[PDB]
Design a protein around this motif. Structure first.
Motif, mmCIF file in Angstrom:
data_model
loop_
_atom_site.group_PDB
_atom_site.id
_atom_site.type_symbol
_atom_site.label_atom_id
_atom_site.label_comp_id
_atom_site.label_asym_id
_atom_site.label_seq_id
_atom_site.Cartn_x
_atom_site.Cartn_y
_atom_site.Cartn_z
ATOM 1 N N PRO A 197 0.792 -1.254 0.000
ATOM 2 C CA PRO A 197 0.000 0.000 0.000
ATOM 3 C C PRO A 197 0.812 1.286 0.000
ATOM 4 C CG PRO A 197 -1.123 -1.645 1.322
ATOM 5 C CD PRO A 197 0.228 -2.262 0.911
ATOM 6 N N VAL A 242 -6.816 -0.229 -4.910
ATOM 7 C CA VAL A 242 -7.319 -1.028 -3.789
ATOM 8 C C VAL A 242 -7.552 -2.479 -4.174
ATOM 9 C CG1 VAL A 242 -8.384 0.761 -2.369
ATOM 10 C CG2 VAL A 242 -9.670 -0.203 -4.246
ATOM 11 N N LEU A 302 -11.462 -9.767 3.130
ATOM 12 C CA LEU A 302 -12.220 -8.627 3.624
ATOM 13 C C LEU A 302 -13.070 -8.037 2.504
ATOM 14 C CD1 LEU A 302 -9.953 -6.823 6.216
ATOM 15 C CD2 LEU A 302 -11.922 -8.280 6.518
ATOM 16 N N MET A 303 -12.521 -7.984 1.293
ATOM 17 C CA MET A 303 -13.225 -7.298 0.226
ATOM 18 C C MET A 303 -14.273 -8.207 -0.390
ATOM 19 S SD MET A 303 -10.745 -4.811 -1.869
ATOM 20 C CE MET A 303 -9.440 -6.054 -2.014
ATOM 21 N N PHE A 359 -16.083 -4.393 -5.613
ATOM 22 C CA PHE A 359 -15.354 -4.305 -6.886
ATOM 23 C C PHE A 359 -15.534 -5.493 -7.847
ATOM 24 C CE2 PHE A 359 -13.108 -1.747 -3.718
ATOM 25 C CZ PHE A 359 -13.049 -0.534 -4.353
ATOM 26 N N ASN A 400 -11.003 2.181 -9.107
ATOM 27 C CA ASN A 400 -10.572 2.122 -7.717
ATOM 28 C C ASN A 400 -11.492 2.879 -6.750
ATOM 29 O OD1 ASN A 400 -7.944 0.525 -7.777
ATOM 30 N ND2 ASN A 400 -7.609 1.958 -9.446
ATOM 31 N N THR A 458 -14.086 4.920 -0.117
ATOM 32 C CA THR A 458 -12.789 5.185 -0.732
ATOM 33 C C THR A 458 -12.538 6.688 -0.608
ATOM 34 O OG1 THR A 458 -13.853 5.302 -2.912
ATOM 35 C CG2 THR A 458 -12.793 3.268 -2.359
ATOM 36 N N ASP A 486 2.659 11.947 3.451
ATOM 37 C CA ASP A 486 2.282 10.573 3.795
ATOM 38 C C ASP A 486 2.132 10.394 5.294
ATOM 39 O OD1 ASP A 486 2.404 9.828 1.024
ATOM 40 O OD2 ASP A 486 4.527 9.256 1.236
ATOM 41 N N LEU A 489 -1.480 9.367 6.762
ATOM 42 C CA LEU A 489 -1.542 8.230 7.671
ATOM 43 C C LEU A 489 -2.036 8.640 9.059
ATOM 44 C CD1 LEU A 489 1.621 6.252 6.620
ATOM 45 C CD2 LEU A 489 -0.768 5.528 6.326
ATOM 46 N N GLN A 521 -6.148 8.910 9.040
ATOM 47 C CA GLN A 521 -6.752 7.578 9.005
ATOM 48 C C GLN A 521 -6.607 6.886 10.352
ATOM 49 O OE1 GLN A 521 -5.656 5.300 5.248
ATOM 50 N NE2 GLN A 521 -4.214 7.019 4.976
ATOM 51 N N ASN A 522 -5.386 6.886 10.916
ATOM 52 C CA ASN A 522 -5.117 6.127 12.142
ATOM 53 C C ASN A 522 -5.768 6.765 13.380
ATOM 54 O OD1 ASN A 522 -3.584 4.141 10.736
ATOM 55 N ND2 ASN A 522 -1.689 5.329 10.957
ATOM 56 N N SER A 580 -10.165 6.113 12.505
ATOM 57 C CA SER A 580 -10.267 4.930 11.664
ATOM 58 C C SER A 580 -11.667 4.335 11.618
ATOM 59 C CB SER A 580 -9.254 3.864 12.115
ATOM 60 O OG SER A 580 -9.695 3.127 13.243
ATOM 61 N N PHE A 604 -13.643 4.904 8.224
ATOM 62 C CA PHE A 604 -13.257 4.276 6.967
ATOM 63 C C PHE A 604 -13.667 2.815 7.038
ATOM 64 C CE2 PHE A 604 -10.784 7.846 5.407
ATOM 65 C CZ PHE A 604 -10.547 8.531 6.576
ATOM 66 N N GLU A 637 -13.558 -0.911 7.129
ATOM 67 C CA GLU A 637 -12.468 -1.852 7.323
ATOM 68 C C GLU A 637 -12.437 -2.922 6.236
ATOM 69 O OE1 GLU A 637 -15.007 -1.376 9.127
ATOM 70 O OE2 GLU A 637 -16.188 -3.236 9.192
ATOM 71 N N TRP A 638 -13.534 -3.139 5.496
ATOM 72 C CA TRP A 638 -13.550 -4.196 4.488
ATOM 73 C C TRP A 638 -13.076 -3.731 3.116
ATOM 74 C CZ3 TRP A 638 -17.491 -2.552 1.177
ATOM 75 C CH2 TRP A 638 -18.494 -1.767 1.754
ATOM 76 N N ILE A 639 -12.547 -2.515 3.005
ATOM 77 C CA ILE A 639 -11.760 -2.160 1.820
ATOM 78 C C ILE A 639 -10.387 -1.730 2.333
ATOM 79 C CG2 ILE A 639 -11.530 -0.682 -0.191
ATOM 80 C CD1 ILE A 639 -14.441 -0.416 -0.401
ATOM 81 N N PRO A 640 -9.437 -2.651 2.437
ATOM 82 C CA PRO A 640 -8.127 -2.303 3.009
ATOM 83 C C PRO A 640 -7.474 -1.157 2.255
ATOM 84 C CG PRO A 640 -8.386 -4.663 2.871
ATOM 85 C CD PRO A 640 -9.525 -4.078 2.081
ATOM 86 N N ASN A 641 -6.914 -0.210 2.993
ATOM 87 C CA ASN A 641 -6.064 0.819 2.388
ATOM 88 C C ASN A 641 -6.834 1.650 1.367
ATOM 89 O OD1 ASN A 641 -4.117 -1.928 2.801
ATOM 90 N ND2 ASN A 641 -3.508 -0.022 3.836
ATOM 91 N N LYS A 680 -6.104 6.759 -0.877
ATOM 92 C CA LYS A 680 -4.981 6.920 -1.791
ATOM 93 C C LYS A 680 -4.701 8.397 -1.998
ATOM 94 C CE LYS A 680 -4.366 2.559 -2.559
ATOM 95 N NZ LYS A 680 -3.488 1.879 -1.571
ATOM 96 N N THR A 681 -3.439 8.728 -2.239
ATOM 97 C CA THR A 681 -3.049 10.122 -2.338
ATOM 98 C C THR A 681 -2.153 10.299 -3.556
ATOM 99 O OG1 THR A 681 -0.933 10.375 -1.181
ATOM 100 C CG2 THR A 681 -2.838 9.918 0.192
ATOM 101 N N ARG A 691 -12.381 -1.706 17.275
ATOM 102 C CA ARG A 691 -13.129 -2.931 17.053
ATOM 103 C C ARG A 691 -12.170 -4.104 16.895
ATOM 104 N NH1 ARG A 691 -15.159 0.555 12.928
ATOM 105 N NH2 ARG A 691 -13.107 0.098 12.014
ATOM 106 N N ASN A 741 -10.283 -4.099 13.496
ATOM 107 C CA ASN A 741 -9.739 -2.911 12.850
ATOM 108 C C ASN A 741 -8.216 -2.996 12.874
ATOM 109 O OD1 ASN A 741 -8.745 -0.364 12.153
ATOM 110 N ND2 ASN A 741 -10.393 0.748 13.208
ATOM 111 N N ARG A 750 -5.882 -0.914 12.385
ATOM 112 C CA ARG A 750 -5.124 0.311 12.626
ATOM 113 C C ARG A 750 -4.825 0.540 14.104
ATOM 114 N NH1 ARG A 750 -3.997 2.870 8.298
ATOM 115 N NH2 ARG A 750 -5.215 2.280 6.441
#
Ligand SMILES: Nc1nc2c(ncn2[C@@H]2O[C@H](COP(=O)(O)OP(=O)(O)OP(=O)(O)O)[C@@H](O)[C@H]2O)c(=O)[nH]1
Ligand SMILES: Nc1ncnc2c1ncn2[C@@H]1O[C@H](COP(=O)(O)OP(=O)(O)CP(=O)(O)O)[C@@H](O)[C@H]1O
Ligand SMILES: O=C(Nc1cccc(Nc2cc(Nc3cccc(C(F)(F)F)c3)ncn2)c1)C1CC1
Ligand SMILES: Nc1nc2c(ncn2[C@@H]2O[C@H](COP(=O)(O)OP(=O)(O)O)[C@@H](O)[C@H]2O)c(=O)[nH]1
Ligand SMILES: [Ca+2]
Ligand SMILES: [Ca+2]
Ligand SMILES: [Ca+2]
Ligand SMILES: [Mg+2]
Ligand SMILES: [Mg+2]
Ligand SMILES: [Mg+2]
Lengths: 439, 425, 351, 54
Positions: A175, A181, A397-398, A404, B256, B309, B324, B328, B331-332, B335, B338, B340-344, B347-348, C31, C34, C36
């Motif tokens: 990442p 993604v 997870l996705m 998508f 994306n 997203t 960055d 970061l 997000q942290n 959190s 956002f 959790e089931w779309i990791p990451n 985007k920047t 959670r 999570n 993070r």
């Protein structure tokens, strides 16, 4: 002599191949216009370097390479760049619009319409080969070309060259350096379709390379140029035995014999030392003992994981520079009494050692210092399965929400190919844990 | 993937679209006559994305200007950059659409739509690699709303595999020309949900509040509202218009950003929020303002939803390391907001060329489930009139049936459900 | 604001650590899934160590040492002691012990178990043994019952020398075991908590009937039920250090530090030093701490014996407050600084 | 620690040190899958144009 063909697919594969062929030229003293003043057999030959270069009557040494991309801009930078004269136009193949980070778009939709042109340009190269051994394939797990087109290519190569060996160099998705993604989806899809067609696959996690660049090169935010010059040093270590006189790993079949007893567990972990900033004012050169010992620190691996908590099935040490067997065996005896190196019971605890006396070559003006000796360890450890678990978790997870998926179904793919690929990965993870964990 | 075709429809669509071509023609060094005049050759590496180059190395926007009455396009042709536009690309009728979606979609607009498609076909044919379309329009009138969505339906028929993006101004009772705007908007959203890849939801309410509470303008005009839209449109497209590591195209963003095909309505943001000061902004300040709901252009509280997203585009010279870290950090620290089931899923990107008048800026593109609040509002204003069938005669007199209204309202309430499903997932 | 997650809800210790972290107003619980997080209070089984330390911008810490189960499983412990040179067969503080697999499973040490068992048939020495698995306890001087009882079960057992002549506290003529709590931080500092506890029997030890397993099994549960004198001498079969020291002073004329603790610190330090290269997270991308419970027995010659290492220990009721505050102090705030009750075990003898 | 199969040359040497002993689808079947996904694309596209035709 037996020839090797390099296939670079997609952006990551092309930019990494550029880095590697530049390195190869420096190492064999081949100038950017393809002239090799030290090759005294003008126009032909079958030295070790001819595994990777052909020769013309004008004395031009030409990579046995094909670059493939579904979009032109990266390979266009090859066609106009420092090594433009090196390659023949027919070896540089571009489409018009890329796979948009979509595995199914690169495999099913856009692949189908370019695969035959690529196999024909690849046969053009096979035809100038007296005894081809097979293929080095460079690609990313995460791009739509790198995943989808590469898997299509791998299937077809098994069909048209069913006897030849196939090695991959794969960029695993990180990442920190990715703008997509869906890389977990593409990664799983392409691993599932490629697994049986690959004899040996060297995975490079962009995250490990990124952190080696920050930590040991003092590069604040690494670019692809930084990553690739380091990755190419490692690839160079791995292929030097194909390109130089020696007795360890002299053909592609030997990489499987030495590194892969069980053919599905074909993902050796690479570890490289020393990585030293060229801007480092004062540097004490590291001994054989120190660089060999560094081969067992996770921070020097191509994939962060922990080999203390798995088992080894094979181990190769590949040294460049001022090294002699006595120093290596002393270093190994010391390391063995201080580190957790457990082999699987049906394998010998041992190391195959290759020493090439020329120290590593560095790109003038790059980030890497010249050093007196360096080493690349290739170990087939079950700990690399950690990288599959990471990836599979992200996919799970996705996919539980079908996030998508519609982009893939809309290309011709069936939803069930997702869970097929995922269950192959589950088989894979269980394979690893069987070989490497006791109850 | 290279050339983009831009369409602007109706009054709002053409006023904002004109501002967009002013702003980006200033960025690319192009002057009001089409002649380049800058310094960096990077004003022109990707100039083909939005400009056709004519003889004399003169640059002409790939812009089609549509309206059902001549008023605003005579204004555009008299405007600052009015001469930039290819005169064959002004397509207009005479009768207007009377703020009536049915006239734009079914009667007046139908008469006009094929001649618009002829200009589109000619612009496409001269494209090496057409990547798709963008449309600027409002959803509250008749032309941009009704004919604008008729166009989108026609373009999809003829180019089913190109990307379709809209910049769509949402009506608000606070900034309102007529009481039928909720009817027009609901009819339009039903179209947008099926035939666009991306819809940038610009709430006129949010533009008004920004101008008033933040820019300290007591009497905001449409001109001040459009200054904010063209600044956001510039930032949203800067990655496509200038060389950088990203090599941005339309499709990869669509792929994306959109995990489910109907959930493609984006919340735009801009920072720093300016009004035509000299303070240097820090990267930590950019990053906090970019994520601030007061810098967002759809009047929705991101804290009331979850981000599926997020695209963040920084402009100017700054530390990538610090960007960055700051990214970061948000997000942290927040959190839960956002998924959790779309990791990451954040985007920047960075473009080294800043916009006019700023040394550093950031653009925010959010796919949040809180955009449902926008569609709830419209649905409440709609139902408040529709339960008494008020103002319908303006539409039934153009051929429409009440059933078509009931279907469009049901589709919009479905889209609100879809969003609420993933806010709880 | 640091972030943490909890994934073991049946953990008294880390339940209290969780509450203490919240009440600082600088820690936020996320959670269970999570990613993070700064801190993971993890599950006891199949903790996913391979997913830690890959979150850019997050220093990550977990309350378990991947690999420490080689210390916290009876068979693992026996294998580790007998095969590690620095512990070795010639290990003076561990009871003679053999790894025994059931017959349905058939490596195994029944071979060498009887070889030494005969030298106690031959040598007239006390040939009593105990068998246990990682409920299910058998003490008997007849090996034929031991090996029969193990095959009647399904999992691996260990046959261990039973310490027949233990130090018995008066008034009572009764058994006990000592429990020490040891915190290993991310730097591999080894911290012994200054308060231990004696898990006591309230029944007079009797060496004639090894089947009456209530004066022989000082486990706090077997004594809460099957024992009729629960709570007589001390509250809940638990004597703490201030008293045990005083008893040793009065009965035997020695102290707790000299007669027992020096040996305990030697044993703790030896076990953790042994597996340190296998489990340290010095140069890893995530970091571990862990709390261990060490279980000791004292024979009549004031010799300490190590019985078992517990990787997921409960603490004693009155001590929960002090210990869980101490975990937060040295294991967590050391890594995540906000805005001793331990003895550090270290020794550098030059030779 | 046994050293074995030592080979030497001008450019280097190689050897093996032992510490312990041991304790495909066809062109046709690919073309079919690539055509069964293209038919699914052509179907989806026809269902869209049928919908646009309504
Ligand atoms: N190490 C390294 N990684 C790269 C490079 N270029 C791209 N990547 C990684 O590869 C993944 C993206 O894939 P790409 O190779 O750019 O995609 P592609 O194969 O060209 O396919 P398309 O989707 O059609 O553009 C991400 O994880 C990137 O970080 C590179 O030059 N070096
Ligand atoms: N070799 C041995 N000799 C004498 N007594 C022993 C012994 N091994 C265990 N015991 C007795 O049994 C108890 C320890 O049993 P065990 O070692 O199996 O703990 P356990 O896992 O069942 C519960 P916990 O893990 O919390 O301590 C001690 O109280 C001790 O009195
Ligand atoms: O599309 C338009 N603007 C636009 C803006 C940024 C990028 C791109 N194009 C891309 C995006 C991409 N990945 C990506 C995925 C998520 C986020 C991000 C980001 F932006 F945060 F970095 C990048 N990869 C290649 N090209 C296009 C306007 C509507 C006309
Ligand atoms: N932001 C903005 N909104 C506008 C502008 N002009 C009209 N509107 C809004 O657009 C809606 C009316 O649509 P309009 O474009 O005038 O009608 P059309 O000519 O038939 O497309 C109402 O919601 C107005 O508030 C403008 O220049 N800027
Ligand atoms: Ca030659
Ligand atoms: Ca094969
Ligand atoms: Ca008419
Ligand atoms: Mg690409
Ligand atoms: Mg109007
Ligand atoms: Mg016509």
């Amino acid at each position: 002599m037996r020839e090797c063909i390099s296939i670079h697919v997609g952006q990551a594969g092309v930019q990494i191949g550029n880095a590697c062929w530049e390195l190869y030229c420096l190492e064999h003293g081949i100038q950017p216009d393809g002239q090799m003043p030290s090759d005294k057999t003008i126009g032909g030959g079958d030295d070790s370097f001819n595994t990777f270069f052909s020769e013309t009557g004008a004395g031009k040494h030409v990579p046995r390479a094909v670059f493939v991309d579904l979009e032109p801009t990266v390979i266009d930078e090859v066609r106009t760049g420092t090594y433009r004269q090196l390659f023949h136009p027919e070896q540089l193949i571009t489409g018009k619009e890329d796979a948009a980070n979509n595995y199914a778009r690169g495999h099913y939709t856009i692949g189908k319409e370019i695969i035959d042109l690529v196999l024909d340009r690849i046969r053009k190269l096979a035809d100038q080969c007296t005894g081809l051994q097979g293929f080095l394939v460079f690609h990313s797990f995460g791009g739509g070309t790198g995943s989808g087109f590469t898997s299509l290519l791998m299937e077809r190569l098994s069909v048209d060259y069913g006897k030849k060996s196939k090695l991959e160099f794969s960029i695993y998705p990180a990442p920190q350096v990715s703008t997509a993604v869906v890389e977990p989806y593409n990664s799983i899809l392409t691993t599932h379709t490629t697994l049986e067609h690959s004899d040996c696959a060297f995975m490079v996690d962009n995250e490990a390379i990124y952190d080696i660049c920050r930590r040991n090169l003092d590069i604040e935010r690494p670019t692809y140029t930084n990553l690739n010059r380091l990755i190419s040093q490692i690839v160079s270590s791995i292929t030097a035995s194909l390109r130089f006189d020696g007795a360890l790993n002299v053909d592609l079949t030997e990489f499987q014999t030495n590194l892969v007893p069980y053919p599905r567990i074909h993902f050796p972990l690479a570890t490289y030392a020393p990585v030293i900033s060229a801007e480092k004012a004062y540097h004490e050169q590291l001994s054989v003992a120190e660089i060999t010992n560094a081969c067992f620190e996770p921070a020097n691996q191509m994939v962060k994981c922990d080999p203390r908590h798995g088992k080894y099935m094979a181990c190769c040490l590949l040294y460049r520079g001022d090294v002699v067997p006595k120093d290596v065996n002393a270093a190994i005896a010391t390391i063995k009494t201080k580190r957790s190196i457990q082999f699987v019971d049906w394998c010998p605890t041992g190391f195959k050692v290759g020493i090439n006396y020329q120290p590593p070559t560095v790109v003038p003006g790059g980030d890497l210092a010249k050093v007196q000796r360096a080493v690349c360890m290739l170990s087939n450890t079950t700990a690399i399965a950690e990288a599959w678990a990471r990836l599979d978790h992200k996919f799970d997870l996705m996919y539980a929400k079908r996030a998508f998926v519609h982009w893939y179904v809309g290309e011709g793919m069936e939803e069930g190919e997702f869970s097929e690929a995922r269950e192959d990965m589950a088989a894979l993870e269980k394979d690893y844990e069987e070989v490497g964990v006791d109850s | 993937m290279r050339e983009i075709v831009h369409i602007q429809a109706g009054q709002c669509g053409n006023q904002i679209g004109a501002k967009f071509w002013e702003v980006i023609s200033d960025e690319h060094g192009i002057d009001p006559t089409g002649s380049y005049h800058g310094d960096s050759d990077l004003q022109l590496e990707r100039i083909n994305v939005y400009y056709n180059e004519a003889t004399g190395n003169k640059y002409v926007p790939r812009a089609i200007l549509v309206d059902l009455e001549p008023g605003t396009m005579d204004s555009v042709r008299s405007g600052p950059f009015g001469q930039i536009f290819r005169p064959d690309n002004f397509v207009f009728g005479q009768s207007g659409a009377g703020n009536n979606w049915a006239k734009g979609h079914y009667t007046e607009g139908a008469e006009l739509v094929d001649s618009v498609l002829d200009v589109v076909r000619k612009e496409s044919e001269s494209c090496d690699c057409l990547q798709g379309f963008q449309l600027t329009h409002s959803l509250g009138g008749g032309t941009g709303s009704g004919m604008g969505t008729l166009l989108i339906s026609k373009i999809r028929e003829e180019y089913p595999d190109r990307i379709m993006n809209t910049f769509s101004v949402m009506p608000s009772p606070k900034v309102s020309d007529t009481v039928v705007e909720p009817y027009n908007a609901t009819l339009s959203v039903h179209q947008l949900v099926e035939n666009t890849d991306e819809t940038y939801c610009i709430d006129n309410e949010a533009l008004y509040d920004i101008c008033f509470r933040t820019l300290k303008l007591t009497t905001p005009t449409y001109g001040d509202l459009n200054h904010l839209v063209s600044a956001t449109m510039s930032g949203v497209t800067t990655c496509l218009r200038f060389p950088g590591q990203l090599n941005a195209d339309l499709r990869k963003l669509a792929v994306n950003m959109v995990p489910f095909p109907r959930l493609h309505f984006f919340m735009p943001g801009f920072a720093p929020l300016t009004s035509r000061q000299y303070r240097a902004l820090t990267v930590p300040e950019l990053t906090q303002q970019m994520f601030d709901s007061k810098n967002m252009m759809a009047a929705c509280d991101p804290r009331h939803g979850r981000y599926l997203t997020v695209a963040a585009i920084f402009r100017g010279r700054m530390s990538m390391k610090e960007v960055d870290e700051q990214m970061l950090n948000v997000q942290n620290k927040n959190s839960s907001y956002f998924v959790e089931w779309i990791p990451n899923n954040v985007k920047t990107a960075v473009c080294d060329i800043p916009p006019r008048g700023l040394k550093m800026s950031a653009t925010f593109i959010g796919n949040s489930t809180a955009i449902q609040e926008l569609f709830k509002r419209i649905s409440e204003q709609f139902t408040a009139m529709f339960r008494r069938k008020a103002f319908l005669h303006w539409y039934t007199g153009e051929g429409m049936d009440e059933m078509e209204f009931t279907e469009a309202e049901s589709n919009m309430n479905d889209l609100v459900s879809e969003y609420q499903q993933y806010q709880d997932a | 604001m640091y972030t943490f997650v909890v994934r073991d809800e049946n953990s008294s210790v880390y339940a209290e650590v969780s509450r203490l972290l919240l009440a600082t107003g600088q820690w936020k619980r996320l959670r269970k899934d999570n990613p993070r997080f700064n801190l993971m209070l993890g599950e006891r089984n199949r903790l996913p160590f391979g997913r830690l330390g890959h979150e850019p911008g997050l220093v990550q810490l977990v309350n378990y040492y991947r690999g420490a189960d080689k210390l916290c499983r009876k068979a693992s412990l026996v294998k580790l002691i007998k095969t590690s040179p620095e512990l070795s067969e010639s290990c003076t503080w561990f009871p003679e012990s053999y790894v025994i697999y059931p017959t349905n499973l058939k490596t195994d040490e029944r071979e060498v178990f009887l070889a030494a068992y005969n030298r106690r048939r031959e040598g007239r020495e006390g040939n009593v043994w105990i068998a246990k698995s990682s409920e299910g306890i058998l003490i008997s001087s007849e090996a034929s019952e031991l090996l029969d009882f193990i095959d009647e079960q399904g999992q691996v057992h260990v046959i261990q020398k039973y310490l027949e002549k233990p130090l018995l506290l008066e008034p009572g003529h009764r058994k006990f075991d000592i429990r020490s709590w040891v915190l290993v931080d991310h730097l591999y500092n080894i911290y012994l908590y200054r308060e231990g506890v004696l898990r006591t029997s309230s029944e007079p030890y009797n060496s004639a009937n090894f089947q009456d397993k209530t004066c022989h099994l000082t486990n706090h549960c077997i004594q809460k039920e099957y024992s009729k004198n629960y709570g007589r001498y001390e509250e809940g079969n638990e004597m703490f250090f201030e008293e045990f020291n005083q008893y040793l002073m009065d009965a035997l004329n020695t102290t707790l530090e000299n007669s027992i603790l020096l040996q305990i610190k030697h044993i703790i330090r030896s076990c953790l030093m042994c597996i340190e290269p296998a489990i340290s997270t010095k140069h890893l991308h995530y970091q571990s701490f862990q709390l261990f419970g060490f279980d000791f027995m004292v024979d009549e010659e004031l010799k300490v014996w190590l019985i078992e290492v517990n990787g997921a220990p409960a603490c004693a009721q009155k001590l929960y407050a002090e210990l869980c505050q101490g975990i937060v102090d040295v294991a967590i705030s050391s890594v995540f600084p906000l805005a001793s009750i331990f003895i550090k075990l270290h020794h550098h003898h030059h030779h | 620690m046994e050293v074995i199969e030592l080979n030497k040359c001008t450019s280097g040497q190689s050897f093996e040190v032992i510490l312990k002993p041991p304790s495909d689808p066809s062109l046709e079947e690919i073309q079919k899958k690539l055509e069964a996904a293209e038919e699914r694309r052509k179907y989806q596209e026809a269902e869209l144009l049928k919908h646009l035709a309504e």
